[PDB]
Amino acid sequence: MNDSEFIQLADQLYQKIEEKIEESGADVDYDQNGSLLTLEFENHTKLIINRQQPLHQVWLATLENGHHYDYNNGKWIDDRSGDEFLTFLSAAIFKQSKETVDFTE
């Protein structure tokens, strides 16, 4: 994977996250600022998503931890736990805010 390709895949991810939020109807605000995609819930908690181009990784900050993902199996996979990004993101949105956004189906 080169930088251009990483950008294509990360763009697809960011737009998928945005579209799935709009589609779910959920009360999740999103804003992109440079490489950062911030999700805010009405309880004023947040999730912070970042792209790290030289590493070809996408990162996610929950309330507790940072998570780093590589593109494998046509998905983004946590480099320490193996958890898949979109599955994990849905769980985090529910675990921090109790609303449901399915990013996968």
Do 14 and 32 touch, CB atoms closer than 8 A?
yes
Q: Which residues contact 13 (CB under 8 A, 6 or more apart)?
A: 58, 76, 85
Which experimental technique did the depositors report for determining this structure? X-ray
Do 66 and 59 touch, CB atoms closer than 8 A?
yes
CA 25 to CA 84: how far, in whole Å?
Answer: 23
Domains of the chain (ranges, CATH numbers)? 1-105 (3.30.920.10)
Sheet of 57-61: strands edge to edge? 28-33, 36-41, 46-52, 57-61, 66-72, 75-78
Do 83 and 77 touch, CB atoms closer than 8 A?
yes
**How far apart, in Å, do the first and last CA atoms of the chain sit?**
26
Q: Which of 102, 6, 92 is nearest to 53 (CA)?
A: 6
The token pair at 86 is 């979109």
State whether residue 25 is helix, strand or coil. Answer: coil
For residue 54, give the DSSP letter. G
